[PDB]
Amino acid sequence: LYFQLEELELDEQQRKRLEAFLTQKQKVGELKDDDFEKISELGAGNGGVVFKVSHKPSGLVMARKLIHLEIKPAIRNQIIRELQVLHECNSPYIVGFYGAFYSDGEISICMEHMDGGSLDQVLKKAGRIPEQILGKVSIAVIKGLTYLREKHKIMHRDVKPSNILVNSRGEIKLCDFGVSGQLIDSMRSYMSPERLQGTHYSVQSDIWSMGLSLVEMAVGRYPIMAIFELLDYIVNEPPPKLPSGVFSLEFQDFVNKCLIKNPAERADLKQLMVHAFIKRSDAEEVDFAGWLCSTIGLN
Ligand SMILES: Nc1ncnc2c1ncn2[C@@H]1O[C@H](COP(=O)(O)OP(=O)(O)NP(=O)(O)O)[C@@H](O)[C@H]1O
Numbered sequence: 001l002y003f004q005l006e007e008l009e010l011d012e013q014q015r016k017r018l019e020a021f022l023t024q025k026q027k028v029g030e031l032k033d034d035d036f037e038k039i040s041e042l043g044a045g046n047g048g049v050v051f052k053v054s055h056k057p058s059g060l061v062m063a064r065k066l067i068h069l070e071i072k073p074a075i076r077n078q079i080i081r082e083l084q085v086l087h088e089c090n091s092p093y094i095v096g097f098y099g100a101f102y103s104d105g106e107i108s109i110c111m112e113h114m115d116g117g118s119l120d121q122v123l124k125k126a127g128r129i130p131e132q133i134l135g136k137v138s139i140a141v142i143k144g145l146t147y148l149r150e151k152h153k154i155m156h157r158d159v160k161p162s163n164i165l166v167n168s169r170g171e172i173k174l175c176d177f178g179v180s181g182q183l184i185d186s187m188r189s190y191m192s193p194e195r196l197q198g199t200h201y202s203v204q205s206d207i208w209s210m211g212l213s214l215v216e217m218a219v220g221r222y223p224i225m226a227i228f229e230l231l232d233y234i235v236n237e238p239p240p241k242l243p244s245g246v247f248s249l250e251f252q253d254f255v256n257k258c259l260i261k262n263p264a265e266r267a268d269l270k271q272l273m274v275h276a277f278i279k280r281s282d283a284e285e286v287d288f289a290g291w292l293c294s295t296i297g298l299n
Pocket residue numbers: 042043044045046047048049050063095111112113114115117118120121158161162163165175176
């Protein structure tokens with residue numbers, strides 16, 4: 001394989017992992033419904049269901065997301081075309097992609113299977129996620145958002161613990177980002193106050209979503225009940241804060257900068273990458289893989 005990955009930073013460990021995924025992907029061509037065997041259900045959301053599947057032609061295990069959409073065939077085909085951009089999204093911080101296709105009322109998005117599942121699933125078992133682990137998560141989320149914005153001009157639009165996947169090799173990756181404008185049009189809140197009120201999507205809204213997700217994972221509960229009451233709280237009341245004493249001053253300041261109500265005052269990705277919480281977390285030696293495997297009983 002003639003790898004053209006010099007544009008990415010990539011330490012030797014990241015380089016080996018990404019080249020291994022891309023090498024395995026070469027066994028995968030055209031994806032069809034009849035070529036899959038369902039193993040088990042990984043999870044489900046409001047929009048779709050995700051199954052752990054065996055792709056019989058390649059022998060690969062993958063995560064197949066099925067989204068029910070029975071619309072005009074021409075615009076369903078525009079969605080499928082837009083999803084093909086996922087073949088160009090190669091980053092240590094973005095879930096690997098095998099392909100996307102339509103069959104009998106369902107759009108299938110086939111991904112790299114992440115054996116640690118999502119952070120909302122690990123939060124259920126952990127109770128609370130330690131601050132040092134959240135430092136590594138924050139670096140991965142910032143780096144993933146920077147990659148999508150810089151290389152592909154795409155905003156995530158759905159940052160939350162269920163969209164941050166982890167694995168037994170200690171990798172942390174984003175999934176379910178808004179690669180398809182047409183799929184967005186055809187389809188607890190983590191939405192920013194400005195997005196709830198009606199404001200054009202900005203990178204700043206993803207930063208708010210990350211801030212709120214970090215607070216939830218740190219305290220072990222959604223930090224903000226009726227639907228109007230909850231949204232009114234987000235829009236019209238001060239943002240939540242981490243409890244003092246139990247968390248470092250750097251982590252408190254980091255989440256506070258993500259959760260500033262005014263998006264122009266709220267930190268941007270460049271500012272977050274050089275914040276004391278990130279500089280401290282990047283220097284820390286944390287065995288994320290060991291912590292993950294022990295917390296959820298993975299090997
Ligand atoms: N590639 C994957 N590997 C392993 N588990 C996965 C993968 N993709 C998704 N899952 C799991 O499937 C669950 C359900 O996903 P999903 O249907 O996207 O619901 P959601 O994340 O809660 N909502 P949304 O992303 O907004 O549609 C996730 O939260 C993960 O735990």
